[PDB]
């Protein structure tokens, strides 16, 4: 399970899943219903060892038929891509999601971070069908421990199969916050990673 986690780099709090084998983290912030009504978006965080190749998720758990987001750092430059697989095969580029890389992204030489806004990312056809407003969500996580996408300058780069991947359940309502807009602004305005 993920827990509420203070991001010391930015002062914001995420619902964070820390994976012990990879030493990577997957953080999410979702908008509320009390304030900031339209919830067709969330903020994500991919964080891991600076030497890792790429870090990704599945928004419906299964690799199959759910938005797959994949982030990496090309030198010092963060990248992010939305993808879609109909089986256990190299995913294709998925249009639908609107992705914005936010501040505190890049590398300090110890960690890499990709902090992102994902709009139009909570409803889709197939798989889980979307991220529920309330109740349980199952997310996937995926990680390549060593090797960057083949052409790391291109957000549509081909990539090698993850060295590690699995799934976990979490309470979506616990990841929702009326602080969402404040958090979004704060993260957008954070400078890039440098240490
Ligand atoms: C060359 C590309 C890829 C291939 C051939 C591939 C293949 C597979 C295979 C065979 C599994 C079954 C479990 C395992 O053996 O690890 C799996 C699981 C998974 N993959 Fe991929 N994968 C690829 C890329 C991706 C990407 C880019 C993501 C998302 C960023 C992703 C997300 C997952 C997740 C979450 C699981 C675990 C849940 C499930 O079993 O469906 N994969 N993948
Ligand atoms: C949002 O995503 C869906 C795919 O899940 C797509 O059909 C639609 O065109 C996208 N909408 C916008 C407004 O970009």
Numbering used by the authors: 21 to 215
The study reports:
The enzyme, pyranose dehydrogenase (PDH), from the filamentous fungus Coprinopsis cinerea (CcPDH) of the Basidiomycete division, is composed of a catalytic PQQ-dependent domain classified as a member of the novel auxiliary activity family 12 (AA12), an AA8 cytochrome b domain, and a family 1 carbohydrate-binding module (CBM1), as defined by the Carbohydrate-Active Enzymes (CAZy) database. In the catalytic cycle of CcPDH, electrons are transferred from the reduced PQQ in the AA12 domain to heme b in the AA8 domain, which acts as a built-in mediator and transfers electrons to a heterogeneous electron acceptor. Therefore, CcPDH is thought to be involved in the extracellular oxidative degradation of the plant cell wall. Here, we present the crystal structures of the AA12 domain in its apo- and holo-forms and the AA8 domain of this enzyme.
The AA8 domain of CcPDH was determined at a 1.8-Å resolution, and the final model was refined to R and Rfree values of 15.7% and 20.4%, respectively. The asymmetric unit of the AA8 domain crystal contains a single AA8 domain (residues 21 to 215 of the full-length CcPDH) with a single b-type heme, 2 2-methyl-2,4-pentanediol molecules, 1 acetate ion, and 155 water molecules. AA8 proteins fold into an immunoglobulin-like β-sandwich with a Met/His-coordinated b-type heme. One disulfide bond (Cys138-Cys141) that is conserved in the AA8 domain of CDHs from various filamentous fungi was observed. Asn140 is glycosylated with a single GlcNAc molecule, as predicted by the NetNGlyc (version 1.0) server. The heme iron is hexacoordinated with Met83 and His182, which serve as axial ligands, and coordination distances of approximately 2.4 Å and 2.0 Å are observed between the heme iron and the S-γ atom of Met83 and the N-σ2 atom of His182, respectively. The main-chain coordinates of the AA8 domain of CcPDH closely resemble those of the AA8 domain of PcCDH, whereas the amino acid residues surrounding the heme are different. On the other hand, Tyr108 in CcPDH is conserved in CDHs and forms a hydrogen bond with the d-propionate side chain of the heme b. Interestingly, Glu162 in PcCDH corresponds to Arg181 in CcPDH, which interacts with the propionate group of the heme, which results in a local positive charge at the heme binding pocket of the AA8 domain. The crystal structure analysis of the AA8 domain of CcPDH revealed that Arg181 is located in the heme binding pocket and interacts with a propionate group of the heme, making the local surface positively charged around the heme, while most AA8 domains from basidiomycetous CDHs have a Glu residue at the corresponding position, and CcPDH is the only family member with an Arg at that position.
